[PDB]
């Protein structure tokens, strides 16, 4: 089920320094987030919703932090970086609500 109930978002990434951008799909699961390529539409990475420490949504890009400075933050271009934060900020309330 590398794509069942998971909402994918077309976000663009900034390669090394290419003035260009690289499209990418981001799957948001109810308990995890995944990096899905827009080129192969395949899952490139998987993350736990309990790993995200914080985020910052702006009318241009979305940023998330796994709390692992070493890993570094992960930000990409998103015209709806807000919804991605509302959809995410929304799953975090549904997983913690059933944990009570």
């Amino acid at each position: 089920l590398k794509t069942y109930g998971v909402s994918f978002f077309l976000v663009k990434e900034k390669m090394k320094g290419k003035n260009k951008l690289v499209p990418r799909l981001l799957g948001i699961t109810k308990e995890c987030v995944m990096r899905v390529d827009e080129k192969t539409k395949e899952v490139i990475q998987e993350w736990s919703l309990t790993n995200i420490k914080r985020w910052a949504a702006s009318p241009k890009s979305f940023t998330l932090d796994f709390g692992d400075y070493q890993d570094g933050y992960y930000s990409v271009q998103t015209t709806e970086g807000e919804q991605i934060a509302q959809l995410i900020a929304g799953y975090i309330d549904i997983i913690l609500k059933k944990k009570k």
Binding site: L49, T50, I52, K53, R54, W55, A56, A57, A85, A89, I92, D93, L96
Partner: peptide, 8 residues
């Protein structure tokens, strides 16, 4: 400002 999550 930033924003956090209840996940303590």
């Amino acid at each position: 400002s930033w924003v956090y999550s209840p996940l303590h």
